[PDB]
Design an enzyme around this catalytic site. Structure first.
Site, PDB file in Angstrom:
ATOM      1  N   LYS A  14       1.083  -1.713   0.400  1.00 36.29           N
ATOM      2  CA  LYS A  14      -0.030   0.186  -0.336  1.00 36.29           C
ATOM      3  C   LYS A  14       0.781   1.222  -0.543  1.00 36.29           C
ATOM      4  O   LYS A  14       0.799   1.977  -1.106  1.00 36.29           O
ATOM      5  CB  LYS A  14      -1.216  -0.158   1.379  1.00 36.29           C
TER       6      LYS A  14
ATOM      7  N   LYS B 164      -1.166  10.160   6.008  1.00 39.84           N
ATOM      8  CA  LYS B 164      -1.255   9.225   6.867  1.00 39.84           C
ATOM      9  C   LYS B 164      -1.346   9.290   8.360  1.00 39.84           C
ATOM     10  O   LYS B 164      -0.272   9.899   9.015  1.00 39.84           O
ATOM     11  CB  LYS B 164       0.026   8.067   6.288  1.00 39.84           C
TER      12      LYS B 164
ATOM     13  N   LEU C  27      -9.430 -12.877  -4.978  1.00 40.44           N
ATOM     14  CA  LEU C  27     -10.069 -13.146  -5.085  1.00 40.44           C
ATOM     15  C   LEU C  27     -11.788 -12.427  -4.056  1.00 40.44           C
ATOM     16  O   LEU C  27     -12.452 -12.048  -3.896  1.00 40.44           O
ATOM     17  CB  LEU C  27     -10.563 -13.650  -5.693  1.00 40.44           C
ATOM     18  N   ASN C  28     -11.326 -13.151  -3.012  1.00 38.24           N
ATOM     19  CA  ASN C  28     -12.448 -13.187  -2.308  1.00 38.24           C
ATOM     20  C   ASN C  28     -11.792 -11.720  -1.476  1.00 38.24           C
ATOM     21  O   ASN C  28     -13.390 -10.583  -0.697  1.00 38.24           O
ATOM     22  CB  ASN C  28     -12.235 -14.731  -0.960  1.00 38.24           C
TER      23      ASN C  28
END
Ligand SMILES: Nc1ccn([C@@H]2O[C@H](CO)[C@@H](O)C2(F)F)c(=O)n1
Ligand SMILES: Nc1ccn([C@@H]2O[C@H](CO)[C@@H](O)C2(F)F)c(=O)n1
Lengths: 226, 227
Positions: free
Chosen positions: A16, A38, A147-148
């Site tokens: 990230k 942040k 994907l989940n």
């Protein structure tokens, strides 16, 4: 104002920060002014400092934060172990709102994922996105389970009508491999994959990193962000 | 019918299969007729077989499979890679309905997360749980990232009115570190933590595994699962 995106990871150790740096680098190279926020940094005990990584990799100077916690935990758990409360909701929303200005892309990097507590009382990165009308850029893996995690995050975003600005695979392996190759295709079916950042990119110097970043994103999408 | 539980995981390798075996074993030791069902099994070309491991660990013989795919990928990609189709919805649903019966606990182990496509077209484990009025037991870790993963899972469950049967920490370290202890505390505030299975439970033999399983769950909860 300008454009506020929240950048949120489908897991930890997902890239990230480097995604924030790479999009900031690409947007700066297209002549866009960029701020990264942040609000809560955790993991300082082991040296985490995401704003500084964004500074080193992308040259952003408008780098704003409100709190820093030693423990490598979700903010509420880090604040609980520190014995010091999280920033207030008003603190986070107003800092971002004051960062935001015409012509500027403001990236708000989460800590601990979309639905965990970021500010008290019980306010999440999702709540913040609603409050500042930010869309959400979702950083994902190409590994099994993505994907989940991605479908779940997209449901959570839709559930509060937070727009999804697309996906970024935070680390793309070399060579890809069988699962990663299938997932990149499958992820493109549920949302726009804005970039896949090569593995090892956080180790690049500023010039190489800006080279990687300029080529990693569609130039027109970046320029269209603002 | 009896009690149907779908057993799903917040991620990969969180211990879904050991939790299925551990709950099956505790329930058997409370005198409950137990069946374990795995409607989609991937990774068979690598030797993956969750039903077989459940029988090995817990001694369950009422095991029901349906679809088996060679590659260790998500069901839709594993099916495509083999040039095969996913099962239809009623093929999973009938498999479960045939096992289900009064006095029985039927555990339905998912394959790769709550929202991954299980049956064509686009049918997930959540859709199956809706169709058979099953609650969901959610298997989780105690590592950083778990709180978000768990809250995403619970919110997706509640969006379709699938009751959460509780959480199970699939692997619990000895000793627990600071992060693990803080996360377990926070997990218990968002749902009931039914158990935290000791790390390395898969290497226990039949008798040690059964004893671990009986000690891992609250006796009254396991006994109340089936009327
Ligand atoms: N494209 C990427 C993505 C991630 N990383 C590095 O992997 C670690 C885990 O996120 C990050 O901490 C890391 F940033 F160091 C990387 O080197 N290059
Ligand atoms: N309580 C637990 C949980 C997990 N495991 C083992 O770790 C792998 C992924 O969970 C499982 O495949 C594993 F079963 F091998 C274990 O031994 N004991």
């Amino acid at each position: 104002g300008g454009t506020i995106l929240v950048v949120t990871g489908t897991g930890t150790g997902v890239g990230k920060t480097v995604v924030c740096a790479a999009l900031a680098s690409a947007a700066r190279q297209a002549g866009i002014d960029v701020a990264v926020c942040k609000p809560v940094q955790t993991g300082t005990a082991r040296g985490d400092d995401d704003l500084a990584e964004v500074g080193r990799l992308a040259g952003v100077t408008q780098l704003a934060g409100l709190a820093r916690y030693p423990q490598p935990m979700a903010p509420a758990a880090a604040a609980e172990h520190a014995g010091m409360a999280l920033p207030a909701r008003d603190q986070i929303v107003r800092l971002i709102a004051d960062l935001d200005r015409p012509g500027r892309l403001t990236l708000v990097e989460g800590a601990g994922g979309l639905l965990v507590e970021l500010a008290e009382p019980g306010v999440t990165l999702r709540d913040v996105a609603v409050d500042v009308a930010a869309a959400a850029l979702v950083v994902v893996t190409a590994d099994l389970g993505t994907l989940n995690h991605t479908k779940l995050t997209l449901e959570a975003l839709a559930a509060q009508q937070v727009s999804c600005a697309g996906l970024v695979i935070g680390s793309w392996p070399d060579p890809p491999g069988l699962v990663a190759a299938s997932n990149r295709s499958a992820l493109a079916r549920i949302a726009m994959v804005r970039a896949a950042l090569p593995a090892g990119a956080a180790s690049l110097d500023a010039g190489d990193f800006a080279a990687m970043s300029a080529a990693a994103f569609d130039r027109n999408w970046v320029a269209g962000l603002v």
